[PDB]
Structure formats: C-alpha cells, structure tokens
Amino acid sequence: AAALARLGLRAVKQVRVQFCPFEKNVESTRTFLQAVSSEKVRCTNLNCSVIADVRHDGSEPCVDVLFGDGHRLIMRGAHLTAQEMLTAFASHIQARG
Amino acid sequence: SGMIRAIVRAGQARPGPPLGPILGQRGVSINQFCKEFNEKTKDIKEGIPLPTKIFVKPDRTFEIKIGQPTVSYFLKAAAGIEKGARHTGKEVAGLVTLKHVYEIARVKAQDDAFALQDVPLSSVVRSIIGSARSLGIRVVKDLSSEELAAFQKERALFLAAQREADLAAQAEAAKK
Amino acid sequence: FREVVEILDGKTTIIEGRITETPQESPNPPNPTGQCPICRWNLKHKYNYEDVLLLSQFIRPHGGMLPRRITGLCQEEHLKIEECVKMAHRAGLLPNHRPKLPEGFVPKSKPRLNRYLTRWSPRSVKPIYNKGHRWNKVRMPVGSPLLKDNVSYSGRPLLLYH
Amino acid sequence: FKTLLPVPTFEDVAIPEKPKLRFVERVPLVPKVRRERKNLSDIRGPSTEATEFTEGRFAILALGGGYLHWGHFEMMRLTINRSMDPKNMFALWRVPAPFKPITRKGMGQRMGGGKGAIDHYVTPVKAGRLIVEMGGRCEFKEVQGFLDLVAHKLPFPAKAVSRETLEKMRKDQEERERNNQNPWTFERIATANMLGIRKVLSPYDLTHKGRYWGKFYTPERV
Amino acid sequence: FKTKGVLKKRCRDCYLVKRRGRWFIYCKTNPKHKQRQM
Amino acid sequence: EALAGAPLDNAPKEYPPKIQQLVQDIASLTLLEISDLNELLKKTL
Amino acid sequence: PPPTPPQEETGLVRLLRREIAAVFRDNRMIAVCQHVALSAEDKLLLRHQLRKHKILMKIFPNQVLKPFLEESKYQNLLPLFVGHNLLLVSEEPKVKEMVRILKGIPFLPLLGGCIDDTILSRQGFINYSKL
Amino acid sequence: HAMGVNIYKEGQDVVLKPDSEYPEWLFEMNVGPPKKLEELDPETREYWRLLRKHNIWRHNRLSKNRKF
RNA sequence: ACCAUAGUAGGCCUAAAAGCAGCCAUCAAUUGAGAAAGCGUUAAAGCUCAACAAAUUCACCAACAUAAUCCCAAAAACUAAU
Ligand SMILES: [Mg+2]
Ligand SMILES: [Mg+2]
Ligand SMILES: [Mg+2]
Ligand SMILES: [Mg+2]
Ligand SMILES: [Mg+2]
Ligand SMILES: [Zn+2]
Ligand SMILES: [Zn+2]
C-alpha cells in the first residue's frame, strides 16, 4: 500500500474489484483491495472511485482499472499473488500516464 | 492547509500571540476570527477557557468548532483553588466529591471527542478522576461535613504551604 | 510451476495466472524418517559442486537459488547447496540456466577462462602482488569451507588453500 | 496476534544513597616513600579475590590481567555516572584506589645508577576479577549496552556480565571440559611429567593448566 | 565516503551492502552516512 | 453440527424442505381442520 | 522431530473464546465485512452511524477466531476470514439500515453473514433488506 | 474567576442532587488507590491492559540505547 | 511489511516548555496506541518507534592501511596413509 502511495495514483479514472468471498483462491485479490483502499492511495486523488463487487456465484476473481491514457488494465487474479498484482499495477499504470 | 488547536478564555480574543504567530502564519485573518469567536463565546458568562478546533483551509478562509472547556479549569473551580500542585501527589491542592466529578462529566459528554464515543458517564468520570490525579486534586466518597471541617483545615495548610513556598522562592530567587 | 502471462489487445491488457505440471518427489526414499530433502536421500556430506543433476533441482530457470522455505532444506545444507551452485555457475556448468538476451550473445569477449572450484567472484579479487615468504605466506582459497565435511575417501583432509 | 508475557518486576531492590561512583584519588594520602620491586606475579594467573558478586546483579569482568591507573578510573567514573539513571541504578567499585608505585627514569638515562623515581600509581588486576559492580531495578540489557563501552576502553580484554551470564559461562566452561574427546589434556600431561615436558613448562603451569600464559587468558583452553 | 574499521548505521535509512569483496553502508537520505569497511 | 452453505443469485432455484412439508401437511387437511388452523393462526398473530 | 511441546491457553485466549461465544449467542445478525484502511475520523464516524441504529462493531484476531469457528456450527464462514476482517454485531437486527451506511462507502464490502441462523452472501443481505 | 466555597457556598454555587438520585457506578470507582498487577485477576480483561502497559514501559526502557 | 484517533496545552517554574529545557505524578476512552522510546518546533505542527489488527525461513557477538634494488621454489582441493 505504500509503494502505491509513493507513485501518485492521480492518473487513474476508476478502480473496481470483482471477487467471490467463498472461494479458496481469493485472498490475493482481497490483499489488493485493502492495498488500494488505504488512506494514502485513496487521498492521492479524489477523482478516482473504488468499487468492490461482491458475488457468490461469479467464481472468477478479477481486477479492472481504467486510466486517462484511454487505457484499460484487467488482471484476473486466480493464481496470481498479491505483490505480483501490485508490481504489475505499479509498472503498468505509472510508466503509462 | 491544516488544523489548529487553540485553548482560549471566554470573553478574551486578541490580535497577538498565540493567535498572531499561529493563525497569522497560516495566512488567515485574525480579526474575522476574533469577531466570530467572540460572538459565540460572549454567550458563556461562566468565564471558561475552551479548547477549540480551527480548520484552516487552502484558500486562507477558515471554519471553527468550539468544544467544552478544559478539565483543568473545571477542577480548579471544583476544588476552588487557583493553581494546581507544584509536586503532585506528594502534596494536596484541593478537594472534591462524587458530585463535582459527575457534573463536570455530564458537562463534557457533549465534547467533540466524547460525543462520537458512546461511552457511559462512568467512563467519563474515570477520565476526569485520572485528570484530577495529576492536577493534585483529591476525590472523596462522602465528604460534606468533613468537606468544610477540611476546607477550614486544608485551606489553612495550603496557605501555610503556599506562603512557605513563596518565602522559600524569595530566598531561592535571592540566592540565585 | 505457475506461469504468469501478459497480453496486449486494443488498449486493454490482460494478466493471468496459469498452472503447469510439477514433477514429484521420486517414490521411494532411503531414509523416509529423514527430515530434510538432502538427508532422506542419504546425500549428506556426499554431493559436491560437481554434481549438477542434484543442484539443478533447486534454482530458478534464470539461474538463481530457490528460497529455503519452499525447498525445505536444513539450513546448513541450504548454505552448502548455495555455495555449490555459485561454484558450478562459475565453473561453466549449467549453461542453459543463464538469462536469455538476444543482443549480448553477439559481442564476443576473450574466450572464457576455464576455471573450477572458485570461492569468490572473479571481478572482486585483487591480484596478490606480494606473495610473501615461507613464514608469512599469502594463500589462495580453493573451494569453500562449507564443504570441508564431505567424506574423504583418501583420508587426507581436502586442501582449501593454495 | 501475539500473546504477552509477564514483565520482570523489582520490588526487592533497595537503592542506596550516593548511587553514583565515588571519586578516587590520583595518589594515596600517605604516599609510599619506599620504592617497591615490581611483582609482575600480581597480574599473572587467575584471580583469587573479587571473583563473586556482592550487592549488585551486573559487573564488568576482566578477561586478561592488567594495570589500572588513574586515567582508567576517571574514564569509568565519568562514563558510567552520566550513562545511568541515578534513581533506578547504583554502581560500586570492586577495585581499590591505585596503591602500587611504579617508577621511571628521565628519558635519556644510561642503564644503572640506581632505581628510578615514583611516577604514578596503579592497581593490579588479575584475570577473572570484577572491576565494577552495578545493581538496580534495571534489566541487564541497558546496563550491558553502556557498560561494554567502559569494558572496551580498559587495558585488559573484558566483558559485561550479569549473575546469569557469569554462571552460564562457568557451567559451560566445566561442561566443555567433561565433554572433551581427546584423552590428552594439559593437566594430565603436565602433572605426570610426560615426555619430560616439565622442562619446557614453568612450575606455575601446574596450577594454571595452560589456560593462563603470561598475563593473557584464553577461555577456550579447557 | 569514509574508510572505517567498524561499520554502523547512523540512521534508520542506512542500508548495508557487500560489493567488490567489501562491506559498505549506503544512505540515500544523508549521503554523509556513507561508509566503506577497510 | 453445521449450518447452511448459502446458495446465490446466478443459480438458486432451490426452496427449503420445511416449507414443502408444511404446504404438504397443509394440503392433507380437511376443511374443518383448515378452519381450525386458520382460527389458531388468527388468534396468535 | 523432537517430542511434542504442548502450548498452554493464556487468560487472554480464554477471555476471547468466552467473549466470542457470547457474541455468537446474543446478536441475531453477525455480518462479516472486510476491514479496510480508513482515517481515524471516518472510522469514528462509521462507529457513530452504527451507534444511531444501535448496531455494534467488534474485532477479533483470526488466530483465536478461526479454530473457534471451525469447531462452531458456523464453520461455513471459514473462507471469509482468511484476509483482514471486521465483525458487525447486531442485536434485534434491521439489515436495510446496516446496508444504508455501507452504501455510502463503495470500497467497503460486506461479504458473508448470518441473519437469524440464515447464512447469506451479499445478495442474501440485499434480499433480507428489501423485505 | 475565583470562588470560595463553604458548605453554604458549595451548595449555593451548584445544583447538588440528593443521594438517591446519583448512579451506583459513581460510588464504586476507586478514589485514590490505582490498582496493581498482583491484585487483579488474570481472567479479567483489565489485568491484560495493565500487562500490556507494563510491556510497553519495558520496551520503552530497553530502547534507551538507540543510536538512531 | 502494516498502521496511528481520546480526556489533554496533565500539574508546575520560565518569554514560551503543547509526548519530548527541567521537577512531580504516570492515571484514564476505545479490540487496540507510553501523560512518550527516538528525530523535529521559538511553543506547536510534523516524521518514526513500541499497540491492535496482518502475518509469519532464519537472524546474540563477531569485520582493522602501509616502505624504501626485484614477487619470491614450482605447483596441487581425493585411486585407499598409524
Ligand atoms: Mg582493550
Ligand atoms: Mg487502554
Ligand atoms: Mg508499530
Ligand atoms: Mg591509507
Ligand atoms: Mg619465484
Ligand atoms: Zn538435514
Ligand atoms: Zn543514514
């Protein structure tokens, strides 16, 4: 959550996280949620909304992030680890923006 | 640009320190705030300095939230004393009962900090008691008759000790 | 062994985890009660820098050591295997475990000096100009002291400095 | 989540007045007029006196032998006095003020002509003697931290120890010597004069057992 | 950079690194905390 | 013991066993016991 | 391995076990909501907006909450607590009122829960609400 | 301001309720003896507050040697 | 990695001592956070520590430049050595 704060999230439009709480594989995506939801990252820009989509049946956890490059970054955490998602997020959404 | 905690007396707001260095550094009008603060605090004739939260904005404008006055004052008046103990707990400053702390509590339950907290009055009374411990002020369960027997003894002992401390402070001011 | 795939399609980027098949521990160990992976195969004090078939099992496709809590090695043996892996890289064994870089294969350097049993890294070692006489003598390290417990069939202790 | 542990509490610690270290004098009040020969034998070998704790739970322990002159006393006094909480800690000298006269000649003298004159005084310290003893309501760790400085600036090698630390290293010292795999020990060979080795050894060795050599003491020596 | 016999971190931001067969202390915040073990 | 497993939105067609045996025990009654039932429910609620 | 060194229950562990045992008894609605990093101001405000409908919030360590819950009748909530979490306690529940405040904050998800012995996902809470 | 309260003045400057009006909690609270560690029951929640506080004091004393 | 809100600028002396010149108490809200262990301020504000929660490979100490004609045997980690 700190490495996201240092990186100036203001280049982002909308961040949603779609996941399924009763699956065994979702801990990673959750960790991502609480990393982006933190006060530092949340207050870097007020133009960005963070939406948590919670469903029992969907069965596939997902993270979708739009930003003002006209870019859409969608990472499906299934077997992906938390800090791999956050590193991918950092190098992807910072270097472009 | 941030927030400011200012503990200020009832009818007294003046365009000099602390308000001059503090508010004047933020780029905020001192006179507008003296005006508003005095508007709101001239209606308290109880003469109680209140800690207040001044939100100072990016555009140099501001907002103000007045809270309940300090427990230090409420207890200074509850014991009827002036200044608190020099060495606290080693010596006594003034005396109080259940009733004092209860009143002071239900007065301060509407404070900004204790407002959001749903805590009962027993909690707030615990806090005020603890704040009495360090002010040099002693609680007692039922003291009333012994409250006054005390005050006629205790006040004479506090006069004796404050006069002895004033004299020894004159001797230590002379020796220095 | 879980590969992470990244795709770029029309200003949308997909990143996904994908699981492949991991080979499994060979069916029947000699010392099943044994705790640590080296030990239950009776390889303690036996493997050297020279034994690649063993070493290549703990490392990454890019040549770096695997972490300890994943592998399960007894701490001591982890360090030994790390020494050995370094020493074996330097010795020019495991040529497939380097990172692949299409540009840098082209620019030849003086043909690799053949070396083996090298404890330090080549770039870090000052030439010893002063040697020194019979009584105060500068000795050149060979192999690592972590392996000084390997079984000696000759009976003479391995010579770690010349 | 982590579960807590009961904190060590000192209800039994009684702090004496003047907890800080006494000033010690450069020269004794009755200066020795008669010039003494130098026993080096008073630095040599293990220590008999001051081996144990008295009041305090912490100490500086001398691993070598050495001479302590006034400079060292000064150093320890200042360094410890401003490094301690006078409320919660007290310190104590386990070593006497320097009493032993040490001579010199003016640089540039030829050999002979007599003894020299008394330059200064020192204190003999045999290996294994407590230099300074600190007690208090302290845990060992703070005291250790700043005591190791002092220990380090002493002429002999030295350590900061507690009661626990000291008995730890003593039990370890004897346990190492009943564990020993090789049949051949310094004691065993020396006493029985095997290989006529007594020719090369000093008599004192019989007591020292090859643990002490000159003023030096190696703890690893069984 | 100073050559020292003992390395010690002079603040929380110092980190400790082995390069060229030596130990080093690098510090990003205070470069004056730089140290090289001799 | 253990509790329910919480089926949800995409597919849940499944109604409880209790409701069904209740509407069955309701459907097996003659209309005098249906009027008795109706009175005993009208009074309590 | 060396022989087995059984660890012993502290007073803290027993106090938490008792407390959670009471918590699952008393409140009719226990709603698991993933704990999310907020300002102290906003957390206080949320606590106070829960004080207005009288709903209470509680937080326990996963350490002592997990085995209690796997030995509980409630074990189907085990996959919910793997991350951070916050336990929403309600006596004499009204769910639409709990959903009202969570609606204000979009990044603060309500995951599982049990309302009067009925174990539900978020959709089950949405269903119980409109009722 | 300044107020000298006697049994006439402490009652005349205050509205002081009867003894049957005041809550039970107000008498139970310990006036001057702050509680110790041995006194409290290890199965009580407050005991562990005190133990935490003491642990913090301990870490605080041990951290006196910080170079940083 | 993570996170920081409450009486409250605790009572004093001082131009000011707001956790942090000094002296004395060291209580108290919250699941949880010292009347504060380091930095910082004129007094603050502000950074971190210990606290919850989150997790958990292992982690006590140990490192030290040099000379004068030209370095100074060559070399070497295993085929069995009381
Ligand atoms: Mg020395
Ligand atoms: Mg508390
Ligand atoms: Mg912390
Ligand atoms: Mg040099
Ligand atoms: Mg030669
Ligand atoms: Zn092993
Ligand atoms: Zn630094």
- The three-point CA angle D52-D58-D62 to 5° equals 60
Method of structure determination = cryo-EM
Alpha-carbon distance of G83 to C153, in angstroms, equals: 55
Residue B85: nearest nucleotide (C-alpha to C1'):
I11
Residue B7: nearest nucleotide (C-alpha to C1'):
I9
Distance of C1' in I73 from CA in D189, Å: 39
Contact check, Cβ <8 Å, G112/A21: yes
- The three-point CA angle F18-F23-F26 to 5° equals 125
Q: Is the CB of G7 under 7 A from strand I?
A: no
Check if the beta carbon of residue D66 is closer than 8 Å to that of residue D103: no
Which of chain D's residues have a Cβ under 8 Å away from the Cβ of H51? 4, 6-7
A79: contact with G, CB 8 A cutoff: no
* Domains identified in chain A and CATH numbers: 1-97 (3.40.30.10)
- What are the C-alpha distances in Å from C145 to residues A82, C74, C81, C86, D77? 39, 18, 13, 14, 46
Closest C-alpha among D73, D64, D62 to residue D129: D62
The verdict on whether residue D120 carries a ligand-binding annotation is no
Residue in the block written with tokens 């207005």: G52
Residue nearest to nucleotide I65 (CA to C1'): E38
Check if the beta carbon of residue G102 is closer than 8 Å to that of residue G31: no
Q: List the domain boundaries for chain D.
A: 2-222
Alpha-carbon distance of B29 to B158, in angstroms, equals: 45
Check if the beta carbon of residue D169 is closer than 8 Å to that of residue D98: no
**Most C CBs within 10 Å: which of A32, A72, A85, as the mutation test of the C interface?**
A72
The one-letter amino acid at G87: L
Closest C-alpha among B110, B100, B104 to residue B138: B100
DSSP C57: T
Alpha-carbon distance of G24 to G58, in angstroms, equals: 12
Residue D221 half-sphere exposure toward CB, CA atoms < 13 A? 12
Cα E28 to ligand 7 centre (Å): 7
Alpha-carbon distance of G84 to G37, in angstroms, equals: 10
The one-letter amino acid at B64: I
Residue in the block written with tokens 């004691």: D187
Distance of C1' in I34 from CA in D181, Å: 53
Alpha-carbon distance of E34 to E28, in angstroms, equals: 9
Domain of G3? 1-130
- How remote is the C-alpha of G49 from its chain's centroid? 17
Check if the beta carbon of residue A39 is closer than 8 Å to that of residue G39: yes
CB neighbours of residue E10 within 10 Å: 16
Alpha-carbon distance of B9 to D222, in angstroms, equals: 77
Check if the beta carbon of residue A97 is closer than 8 Å to that of residue A69: yes
Cα A96 to ligand 3 centre (Å): 34
The residues pairing with D67 across neighbouring beta strands, listed in sequence order, are D124
Label the pairing between strands D212-213 and D216-217. antiparallel
Query: Which ligand is the nearest neighbour of the Cα of C133?
Result: 5
- What are the C-alpha distances in Å from G85 to residues A39, E18, H54? 17, 41, 29
Helix axes B71-78, B121-133, angle to 10 degrees: 80
Distance of C1' in I64 from CA in E4, Å: 8
* Domains identified in chain B and CATH numbers: 1-67 (3.30.1550.10), 68-142 (1.10.10.250)
Query: Which ligand is the nearest neighbour of the Cα of D159?
Result: 1
The one-letter amino acid at G28: R
DSSP H1: -
CATH number at residue G69: 3.30.70.1730
CB neighbours of residue E16 within 10 Å: 13
> What tokens appear for A84 in the block?
């791999």
D214: left (phi over 0), alpha (psi -120 to 50) or beta: left
> In chain A, which ranges are E strands?
12-19, 49-54, 62-67, 71-76
Instruction: Give per-residue burial for D42-72: e unless 16+ CB within 10 Å, then b.
Output: ebbbbbeebeebeebbbbbbbbbbbbbbbeb
Helices marked H in chain G — which ranges? 11-26, 40-52, 62-70, 95-104, 122-129
Alpha-carbon distance of G38 to A47, in angstroms, equals: 17
The one-letter amino acid at A41: V
- What are the C-alpha distances in Å from B102 to residues B22, B74, B97, B110? 35, 11, 9, 14
Q: Flag residues 100-119 of C with CB < 7 Å from strand I.
A: 117
**Most G CBs within 10 Å: which of A17, A22, A43, A64, as the mutation test of the G interface?**
A22
Sequence-ordered list of residues with C-beta below 8 angstroms from that of E7, at least 6 positions apart, any chain? E16, E23, E24, E25, E35, E37
Handedness of CA C100, C106, C109, C112 (dihedral sign): positive
Phi, psi angle pair for E27, to nearest 5°: -140, 125
**Most A CBs within 10 Å: which of G99, G111, G114, G118, as the mutation test of the A interface?**
G111
Closest C-alpha among B51, B79, B85 to residue B67: B51
**Number of domains within chain G:** 1
Give me the resolution in angstroms, 1 decimal.
3.2
Query: Which ligand is the nearest neighbour of the Cα of B127?
Result: 2
What's the 3-state SS for C108-138?
CCCCCCCCCCCCCCHHHCCCCCCCCCCCCCC
Alpha-carbon distance of E18 to C124, in angstroms, equals: 11
Number of H helices, E strands in chain G: 5, 5
Residue in the block written with tokens 């027997």: B149
Check if the beta carbon of residue G123 is closer than 8 Å to that of residue A55: yes
Strand order in the sheet with D58-62: D89-93, D130-136, D58-62, D158-162
Query: At D17, is the secondary structure helix, strand, or coil?
Result: coil
- Long-range contacts (CB closer than 8 Å, 24 or more residues apart) made by B72-75: B72/B131, B72/B135, B73/B48, B73/B49, B74/B48, B74/B104, B74/B107, B74/B108, B74/B128, B75/B100, B75/B104, B75/B128, B75/B131, B75/B132, B75/B135, B75/B137
Check if the beta carbon of residue B125 is closer than 8 Å to that of residue H25: yes
Check if the beta carbon of residue A35 is closer than 8 Å to that of residue A82: yes
> What tokens appear for D50 in the block?
């001051």
H65: contact with E, CB 8 A cutoff: no
Considering all CA atoms of chain E, what is the largest pairwise distance in Å, rounded to the nearest integer?
25
Alpha-carbon distance of D142 to G60, in angstroms, equals: 35
Q: Flag residues 14-33 of E with CB < 7 Å from strand I.
A: 16, 23
Cα D148 to ligand 1 centre (Å): 11
* Among C11, C15, C19, beta carbon nearest to A75: C15
Alpha-carbon distance of H46 to A63, in angstroms, equals: 44
Alpha-carbon distance of D45 to D147, in angstroms, equals: 25
Check if the beta carbon of residue B73 is closer than 8 Å to that of residue B48: yes
The residues pairing with C2 across neighbouring beta strands, listed in sequence order, are C19
The one-letter amino acid at B145: S
Distance of C1' in I32 from CA in G128, Å: 33
Sequence-ordered list of residues with C-beta below 8 angstroms from that of C159, at least 6 positions apart, any chain? C142
Q: Is the CB of H58 under 7 A from strand I?
A: no
Alpha-carbon distance of B137 to B133, in angstroms, equals: 6
